[PDB]
Amino acid sequence: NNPLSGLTHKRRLSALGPGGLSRERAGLEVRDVHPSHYGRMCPIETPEGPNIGLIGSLSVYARVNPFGFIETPYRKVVDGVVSDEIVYLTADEEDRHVVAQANSPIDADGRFVEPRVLVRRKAGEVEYVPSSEVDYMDVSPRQMVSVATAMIPFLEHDDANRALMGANMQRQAVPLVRSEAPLVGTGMELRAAIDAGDVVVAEESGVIEEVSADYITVMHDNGTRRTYRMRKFARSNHGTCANQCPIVDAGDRVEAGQVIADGPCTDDGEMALGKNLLVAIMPWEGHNYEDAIILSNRLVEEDVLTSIHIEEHEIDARDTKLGAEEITRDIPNISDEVLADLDERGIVRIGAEVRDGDILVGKVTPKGETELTPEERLLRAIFGEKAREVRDTSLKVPHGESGKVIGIRVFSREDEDELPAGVNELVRVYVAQKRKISDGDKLAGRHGNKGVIGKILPVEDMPFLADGTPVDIILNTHGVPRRMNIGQILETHLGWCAHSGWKVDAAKGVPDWAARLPDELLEAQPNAIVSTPVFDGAQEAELQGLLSCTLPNRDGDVLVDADGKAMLFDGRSGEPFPYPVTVGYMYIMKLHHLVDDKIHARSTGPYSMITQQPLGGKAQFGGQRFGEMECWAMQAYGAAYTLQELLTIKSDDTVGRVKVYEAIVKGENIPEPGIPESFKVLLKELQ
């Protein structure tokens, strides 16, 4: 889906598989978070459904030792003094020793502050222990988490339940036409993007000799030249748009290891899973009821939440007993209006516009010489049109799909290209879609705050600030204190201060709240980027202070207060909202669950081979299932005919479903259902 999605997959630890355990065999003990998981396997990153606890991500700092166990780095303390010497300890090698937490206060030399400090011990037991007994200590606060988990700002403010989803959903983020880096970060965004290998990193230092959208050439110091080709508009495993673009301008001095060009979901070599939108925390006209989401039309009018999706469509021509399938522009009983987008071969032309039902590749097959209808013979005598023996088996556009034809690949057995036994011509057609965001599209933040798009109001309908700026996303208040994920609120606060910029008051000395604040943050510019590492970063005292330092806009007026809130104006009525509303910026990701994909329906269609019931899935264009639990609901109501209708004339009554179609198109009455073919099968199975 995205580069992060890829990286995490490679860092997966599954207990399932041959030699391992089955899903049903796995009890409750296996799945829960073991003490030894510290620094080795993430306690948060794991699936939600029936696979919870059996799939985990490897922690950030851990590595695998030549025997197949999981080691992890610890700092060595000789005698109360922290040493830079680092040794990796296995799970059971850590149990015999005694470990201090990373955040324990250390002297500038390396000595501890207090005699008794926070200590980790065998069997997940914790106690205070004198400094003389401290063997090791943790490398980092963010040591126990994984890569994806470490990209969740203010993680220590969210319950494990939602934070679990936030991590799992980050891999579900869709690449947008161009990606912005989040205003609020953790620092992991950098190292994550680089190791992803879907960005472009310089191997040897030098200078950009030449740049194009196609490729970048680097003139090294020793005289040799290397050229990195850009992946341009390529289809992924999951129909996402892997497109890379150069960062550096021609003639830039670049050192080795530097990201010279980023790919999908990447801004300046940083994981860019979403956009930075102007958020408002308030229930609004019921359209955000039960975790739905309200959008500003700007996001459509400016392609803010727009993504690109490629589909790969295939068709082949085989040797049959009646001859062989041949791809041609000549298709029986088709007007030239429908073939207008084809080449002389019969293939769609590159750059053409296709809609659902249209023709991509014109293939015909010789049909079995069976005696044509004595009624159609007659009809072919009147109009004197001799029938062709070739039946249309052309590749048409599936229901739902739509876009522009961005590439044709053609293999022929003629041109010595190697095909499987029986295939002559095989054509591939790549069609992309520029999907703007629409209602029902799943939007979410890093804090397990998911939701489909309720309503996209016109840009004028959006509640707005004093200087006229309309918000982008209206999140519903009710769905916050329940989930315990108020990290999304802290993010918005820091998100505003990052957008507005700030300045701590240095007069009369450095303030006591901003005492622990590193020197580089006492002064920030509008649209500045900041880190808030997990189990570190900003604290509640500083965040309150920063809201006070909020630099005014262009008009010289401050927009939000120290509470973090501001005054809004209802764009519909005009009157200002009666109470202060919390306003700032929140990083929102576009997940890969879009209505264009999820929507599906069917009147009639294909059917099963044995049970004669409808097939299953959108891909097969099948009907929904009205199962056992659904049947109880019908039986409960006392809706006899509806329930009968569903399982007979709607399902597998061979003569029935046919005699239902006619009755409808003739405008008659629905006949009395027959015997479900599925039952007959049962009877012949019993025999």
Partner: peptide, 23 residues
């Protein structure tokens, strides 16, 4: 700064100084 190793955009950080070892 947080990761001043590759040649990256400066992402200022609320922190206690983290110098044990890079990811």
């Amino acid at each position: 700064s947080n990761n001043s190793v590759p040649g990256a955009p400066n992402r200022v950080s609320f922190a206690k100084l983290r110098e044990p070892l890079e990811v």
